[model samples]
Target: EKLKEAKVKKLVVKVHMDDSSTKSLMVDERQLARDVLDNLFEKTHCDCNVDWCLYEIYPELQIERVFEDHENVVEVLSDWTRDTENKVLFLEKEERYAVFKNPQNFYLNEKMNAKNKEYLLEESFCGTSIIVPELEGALYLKEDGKKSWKRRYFLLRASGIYYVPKGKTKTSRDLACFIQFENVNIYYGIQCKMKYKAPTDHCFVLKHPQIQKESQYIKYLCCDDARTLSQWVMGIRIAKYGKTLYDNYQRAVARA
Candidate 1:
């Protein structure tokens, strides 16, 4: 594949809508979900005034994930099982992009900022240009889906969400490395208040494709509200991909 001008492979795929309707979209896996959103703008508009993006779902588990704009669609989809109720939707979700508007508010409270106006912190193991929060907040709930509730304040860094601990307040320490980013899909919960009786339904969970929901491997979480859920989602993406995300955000903005 060397000396190639383009390694792009174009495919037409059908994506669903909130009402269970389907539409055909022309796309390439190498492109970001941001690009897919841009293309959608050219053809149609979905149920809106809500945060927008491409949606990925697993119906059997009844779990869902908003495809982050920075993610490579092909790479994300490759993690799914070949056959199941998994679907992609062009839907507007309240939790999808709320943080993009006021990231400083979200992170500064959790925190991030300017530096050669100051200087730089030697913290990033990622080497990504996009900055991440300096630290932590709001205990997210984890479930064995059996043994009651487990809550922990999660720290986003080192290209993963460290499933953090309680008593150990601060100063460098390795948090639990069990569920790193990219290895699993961060799913936002829907109609879960009855099922999980989750606190306020502002819930999210991490589960990889083909893995059944066992307590040992899966992650369950809850946030203060829907916006906080979106903020955590953004934090994960920025920390997970860093500069690549900011770059995609730039191009996606300019072209549209």
Candidate 2:
């Protein structure tokens, strides 16, 4: 009751996986390492029988600490200092884990179109060497009055969605345009484009809040397949509303 009355705050931790994937989780500061491990297991849907370990990596100090199941995370990491760039790594010791052998296969299915299959194959090839901090890939976008769709490399940042010319080296200066999420509305299905006078089918649309002269405030974006499209939608939502949702969760727990 005393702890509940005190309204203990939650810690925001970013878990980095060995398979080049990352996840953000909110944990109670007073929770034990077992709690964290269970949370990670639930989030990653990993097999509980497999041996997994969590490591606190301190790049600046050139060292790390392996967490024990009985220890409290906050107590163990109380003295460990970190900057914005630091993150904890969740490593699976067993080689037979599902994530290690085939990560994408677990999330995607075979219901995609032929064009989508080609795009995804190309995307996998292109993405092998590119490792940006956030969600990125090659998507198709339709320009106003353009009969053909244009392929562009997109980067989803905290600030907004940025794009560069197809096959161009991605740099700060090469950013062609950016659309802020604050002024954007995302919708599923093709109705959005048809309602806003866009040219595309089986894609998602980004609708601008403000109207332009003699132009529909819609931008059409198509991903490789339904699974990839769902990923993009979820990623965009996270990039835009993650902080707000976290705050809401904190407040709800604090009040409870």
Candidate 3:
């Protein structure tokens, strides 16, 4: 009870994965790594176009030196690829995870067309989500664990078609198949604001030369733009999460 009372309402917490030190490389067949990183960059940048962006890795641990390492450094193209998990740890590691923005908030600004909106309502009544027929597709689940029905909107990379076998579109009905979909608004809140009275955490005082060096290399590779590198890294993580979801879904269906 006392701990709860003393606990800060907005404290930045660092979440770390189990494996942090291991490194791997990407081959021509393993280029999915690039795609994954690129995708994450797009998602975070709010722009799906990756043509304007560049990707690279760095060795400096300081944020300011992001531009320096990439310029003078000659990165060896090893047969094996190194995983960027270290970068994640650099940003979220103990003694390094300073409470910056408290609760980080992420927002999705997507406007749906008329036809998609109609489909959404129909799926709600059907008690089962109807997958939006898309060629290259992407799906995002509601981060909130409680609300089972508030599924994230579906995204199509290329082209697709949809059809309803049950209800007729001609008839104006509350729940009808092949109905036109209207626009949709999806929004969520993430806790990002932090309250730090003092540097109580280890991250605030620790020195991470390795992280600084890596970030510097990344910055240099991306023309000293940390934001660009961050986007690419985020894109890769998104793809990884997607694969994980597909695996889980397949396993669950197989059990049934």
Regions of candidate 2 where Cα sits further than 4 Å from its true position: 1-133, 191-202, 209-214, 247-256
Note the residue pairs that clash in candidate 1: 107-111, 115-118
Residue 136, model 2: lDDT of 75
Which stretches in model 1 have alpha-carbon errors above 4 Å? 1-12, 18-20, 26-35, 45-52, 93-97, 109-128, 138-140, 145-147, 163-169, 174-178, 209-216
Tell me the spans in candidate 3 whose CA falls farther than 4 Å from its real position: 1-19, 33-191, 195-256
What TM-score would each prediction reach against the true structure?
Answer: 0.70, 0.40, 0.17
**1-256, model 2: which lDDT tens digit per residue?**
3555567878776778989698877877888766787788778787654446566554432223344344467665554444333357787543212221232432244656655554543443234342212577777776775545667888877657888876667877887655787876454544434443334444665654232222445666777776666556655644554444233223323322
TM-score of 2: 0.40
Q: Candidate 1, residues 1-256: lDDT per residue as tens digits?
A: 5786866787676778677888787778777787777777666743333356788877766687777677677677666666756778887665443344344544452234444211232222225355776546665575564634666776666467765566765555646654677686677767556776766778777776547443457777778886677677777766665666545444544654
Q: Model 3 over residues 1-256: C-alpha lDDT tens digits? A: 3555553232121212234342222223233322333333433452332221122222222222111111111121231125432132111121110101110110111345545443442442233332222222112222222222121122221111122223334222322221111211011111111211111111111112233222211111111133322322222222223233233323322322
Best by lDDT: 1
Consecutive 10-residue window with the lowest summed lDDT within model 1:
116-125
Q: Pick the winner on lDDT between candidates 2 and 3.
A: 2
